[PDB]
Symmetry: C3
Subunit: 216 residues, 3 copies
């Protein structure tokens, strides 16, 4: 027996719960296991979109040895804090993808990814911990994505890009491909703004916006 959850019942989680249901009911063929929301804003249990929603204290108290959690909180500092808590409490991180999520050949994705509908992860891609690939995003060939990286919808991450830990890529941003000899790097904790057109390396901790992308 198993219990599933989406951690976060705000916008990120409410737009991922249908995806977690595709992952569980269809891709895993599991019509038996329960799925709930976890949200620490809750004191008493409530329902959110027809699912039971409870705080983490209550989720921990469930008498099941086999718990699986998708963290659906876009803020990657929160997501890492929760992931470390879950692993320490013996709860499994759970990767979710949609029926329309396309995964190509020789792709490695660490546990706990949120891979939205219409996402493509192309050939020979490696992705670290609790990746968020929101609706329509793609990661093209030979990319290396670090831990707790977050894509907004419709991110165009072209080939031979290396995105370091905790970077955030905003809605509709486009990143130029690297080459085998020179991957294009997005530095640790960098923020690429909505609609940014990135044609050069982004330094660690930089905020870049516009077409062409510039420091903000």
């Amino acid at each position: 027996s198993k219990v599933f959850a989406v951690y976060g019942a705000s916008g990120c989680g409410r737009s991922l719960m249908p995806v977690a249901n595709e992952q569980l009911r269809i891709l895993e063929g599991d019509t038996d296991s329960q799925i709930v929301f976890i949200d620490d804003a809750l004191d008493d249990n409530i329902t959110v979109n027809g699912y039971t929603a409870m705080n983490y204290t209550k989720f921990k108290s469930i008498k099941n040895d086999d718990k699986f959690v998708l963290i659906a909180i876009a803020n990657s500092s929160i997501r890492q804090k929760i992931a470390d808590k879950l692993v320490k409490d013996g709860i499994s991180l759970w990767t979710v993808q949609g029926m329309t999520t396309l995964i190509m050949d020789e792709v490695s994705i660490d546990a706990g990814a949120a891979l939205s509908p219409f996402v493509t992860i192309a050939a020979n891609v490696t992705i670290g911990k609790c990746f968020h690939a929101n609706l329509y995003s793609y990661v093209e060939h030979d990319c290396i994505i670090g831990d707790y990286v977050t894509f907004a919808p419709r991110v165009s991450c072209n080939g031979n890009i290396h995105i370091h830990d905790h970077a955030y890529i905003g809605t509709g941003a486009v990143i130029k491909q690297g080459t085998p000899d020179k991957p294009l790097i997005i530095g640790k904790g960098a923020i690429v703004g909505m609609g940014a057109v990135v044609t050069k390396e982004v330094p660690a901790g930089a905020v870049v916006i516009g077409n062409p992308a510039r420091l903000l």
Copy 2:
């Protein structure tokens, strides 16, 4: 028995007729009902892409009590005029979606929407009359869309956005999310240009273009 139609046999209608066929033949499982084009440019009936195409006078004359019409005219002033005519003549507005259109939980859409392939309508969204969501568009969580709103392809409408009546959002435009306390508003009859990156409220009747969006 029933008769279906796509009103408009120009570009909007010719790119929606396949979608209306997915809605009718597959999602409704109806292999019996006829589907035609209506276009008031026509005097004599013709064929358009292998479908009978007639003017509205001829469509009205069909002896069937049960008529269902998708209005496939992007101009929302025309679309409202036609919708009011259809309802007054006792013809039903008909929502169409594609096989790849994704509708999430607790979504309310008024009759007569044109929901193209690869469209996502995310959680807890409310949409008014004869919405056009062209190819690849999305409406994220907690949005409220008014009546006769029109999206070009690939519109990225993020969460907690309120789009008032008759707004037009152009190809590939990106709109920043609001918050629960402050929805980002697109005003009545506003025009957001192709590729605009919108990060603030757009006044009623405003035309905005560019990255960042500015008045035109």
Copy 3:
């Protein structure tokens, strides 16, 4: 009996080989025919993502009268050179599309197109030789695409656009629709940059970038 190949085992080919497998195994229902990579960088055969990869000399030497090749090299000058070689050696060009590629009514596409996942080719479109439509691209109604045209991912080619031979359209570019009386023309060998917002005719051989698009 038949033999299939993807010509190019770098990023373009490795992200198209899964698509060629959808075309062959599912859309053609062919679980018998072998599929390999061709790449002229190779001396000895190798494997690429679990497929045999060989140079063109070795592919020619295969004793099969019935060879079918998708050219997965984005550079259109190389693609034309290879296509002319294949036809002269009595090898067939092979169109590939994905399970999620949407083709609408009265569409004409010459042999050898690479039509990626999530691509839409809308109503009444005509496309010439070895077209590349990378992930998420669309070509809307009444477009005429010439020979050896190349789209990056997420190109938004709106209606009544004429793209002449060997043009290249970059990632996420948006092109304004033409009208029946005045198609918007992208000239022969023009380059439209990533994220460009094109609202006017692009001259032959021009390079245009930005929002709005300007000469580079």
